[PDB]
Symmetry: D2
Subunit: 233 residues, 4 copies
């Protein structure tokens, strides 16, 4: 068997075991700032991703086994105007050499063309695109910006959101939950996801986020902490 | 600091680090059978509880600190008739010397009289009593059979339910979630619970369950696995 | 499988998941004081033991498997006079209902009569009895006060000793090591121990210590911290 | 704080979270073969290293803190002739971009010139060079092929050696132990090592090994398993 685990109470300003992509950076105070902020205000047309350094062995073709994993992180999405927000933040798995994809509604995870890339993600969508449901939502996405399953999400502006995500290999069940401690409000969505068929044997895990493509659709996407463990046997 | 953790993939037929109360027993196959089964059929007027041997330090008066904990267990509730079920199963914390309370709708956790006992529990209620909401539910209960918060629960007869419960001391947030891998269906409920004011410094953690008080309101309450960790600092 | 683990950075003055036996108590500062101290000076004819509350499943007759475990603790032995010391302190496993045995050189673990009790222990002996080697030693003991294997031990008066003990089930190897960080000095002893044949399926783990039987052979036996994990599969 | 941990019961033939350097490879059976083997026989002039993918934060200049870590691995060194062996294998820490250094007696870790590189290592030396003690030894090395402290090591040809290494930041104590389960024989060495002064803030951890520079001084250097955890607070 192979177990791999890591836990940050906060992030290090120059983090060597976190690959920073796009505009992602860690603040002096140890927040993982996924999207751009200038003069303490979020900027549009921004995209940032962060991956853990060590690839995670999620399945093995030789032994035909699949990994079960669990991760918990807290994040904040703040927007100067509650009514106009975009685009969102997501936890995702992708091939180790994964690079930022389309910005805006694609969340830096997906793009177009039949050549849709291997990426499984739990997204926290704050903007209803043409492929979305009408209200803000938490979606389970499998190789597409369109969620296979989702649950309506009462986003709370600027409030800390605690997230727990677990994948049970034995039942191919991916579950994702969000709780705002502020008002003890929760949401959850689960889906049957075959990882072997959606992703390669090894993957990198992390976060991706994008601010909106207009000045009036901006917000922050900061990750405050992160714990993650995966076991393959 | 003090960390305490334990993990059973299944239970041992004669388990010395599990205190069995009432009719609770572990089957040869390693299932924690909370309620009575005779000829493979659940019997009425049954009550069983199971606690971990070692008390858990959840708060300390001297250092004024509170513990954060997390537990995951999978359970099955099977009833010969879908329409008539009772009463339920619950994960709970109570003083170390805790003993079974009222049966039936009280879930072996609570009883009557102003002398209501110290017990915090996440309950999986399958019968609507006079103090319940109308439909089956997952409730957060604080020193009362009446839930402070609850979420409607689409109970699936005989199907495995995976549960994750976490308490974040820093925000006094208790969250409880249920997912049926069978059909990737989920439910979640969270509540602000001050543990210091509801329970003593040390507690025992475990499960409690009761079958209905009539022959036509019977079901099983089996726990298949259990992991639990708590840290106090 | 079944995993069980606990970690104290220090002890709680009134510890509910530590069974205190004999004169053992935890000080206000959180030290596990195994032997008696009066006016800050160790007293003779003292014996104290401490066990973790939850029994540990070390082997299972049905599945014919044995547990692998590992524990680390730091301890101090202080004596007003370097030349005259007694008797020692030990980490040990014994049946769950284990009670203090003979004092003095028997370390509160063993006694006489063909009815020698089931107890495996790693002892830190500070007095050469008739059954001991001549110099102070770390011994692996299997159902006898006489060590099966030992290594000469350069005891450092009043200095912190860090101990790591591990049992590898697959090779029936018990290893015990001591390091004084003060002067980076180390000692180690290992032995082939069949746990199934020496102890029952379930056991309690902990510490035992005794001061000498004369006024001029006194010392303290304090445990400062303790971590312990055991897995059975 | 930041915790990082990983555990392999064995290695994966194409391991993406293990950087393989020099001649190092993983066999079909999952052994980490550090040095070359041709027709099942070890070859001379060989050097192989393996590092974990994710850098480890061992100290932080801003917060002036140091990490405590612990690792356990089992390894085998087999030589066709007991009397003539070389050179050895070592666990080591070095800057993340670390590359193989001199072969032979330098163990792929060190080389010459005042420009001696930052590398701390626990070495299992099977050949007495001009800078070594006379007999085979386990050495603690700090930025030099010459060990600061060592203990004579009774190497057992072809037998499994279990190793436990721990660094206690609070006392700057590095301890390294070896036990042969075959005959319950142990060795240990500890040293006061200031990591902040010997290595940069971030490092990569892993193994390095070299076979001798002559045909009659050859042996294997295989790692069978590996667990490692480090916490910085
Ligand atoms: C395709 C795409 O990303 N569309 C974006 C949408 O996601 C949102 O950010 C909007 C804000 O004005 O700008 C565009 O419409
Ligand atoms: C107070 C109480 O437990 N009432 C019980 C209720 O919980 C349910 O089990 C019912 C089934 O016929 O029997 C009684 O009404
Ligand atoms: C049998 C026995 O415990 N003998 C004790 C010995 O252990 C030591 O404590 C000594 C000190 O004067 O007192 C007695 O001889
Ligand atoms: C400097 C150096 O590595 N010297 C090596 C020594 O380590 C050993 O391998 C020997 C075997 O014949 O070959 C050389 O002397
Ligand atoms: Ca969207
Ligand atoms: Ca009810
Ligand atoms: Ca003695
Ligand atoms: Ca050498
Ligand atoms: Mn979406
Ligand atoms: Mn209820
Ligand atoms: Mn002895
Ligand atoms: Mn050397």
């Amino acid at each position: 068997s192979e177990v791999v685990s890591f836990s940050f109470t906060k992030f290090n300003p120059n983090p060597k075991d976190i690959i920073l992509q796009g505009d992602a950076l860690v603040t002096s105070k140890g927040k993982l700032q996924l999207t751009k902020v200038k003069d303490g205000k979020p900027v549009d047309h921004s995209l940032g991703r962060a991956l853990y350094a060590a690839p995670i062995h999620i399945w093995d073709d030789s032994t035909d086994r699949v990994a079960s994993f669990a991760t918990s992180f807290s994040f904040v999405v703040e927007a100067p105007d509650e009514s106009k927000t975009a685009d969102g933040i997501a936890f995702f798995l992708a091939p180790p050499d994964t690079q930022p994809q389309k910005d805006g509604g694609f969340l830096g995870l997906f793009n177009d063309s039949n050549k849709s890339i291997q990426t499984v993600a739990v997204e926290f969508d704050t903007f209803s695109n043409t492929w979305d449901p009408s209200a803000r939502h938490i979606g389970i996405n499998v190789n597409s910006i369109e969620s296979m399953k989702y649950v309506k999400w009462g986003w709370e502006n600027g409030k800390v959101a605690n997230v727990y995500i677990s994948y049970e290999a034995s039942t191919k069940t991916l579950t994702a939950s969000l709780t705002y401690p502020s008002n003890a409000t929760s949401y959850i969505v689960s889906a049957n996801v075959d990882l072997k068929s959606a992703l390669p044997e090894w993957v990198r895990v992390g976060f991706s986020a994008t601010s909106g493509l207009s000045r009036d659709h901006v917000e922050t996407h900061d990750v405050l902490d992160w714990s993650f463990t995966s076991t393959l046997q």
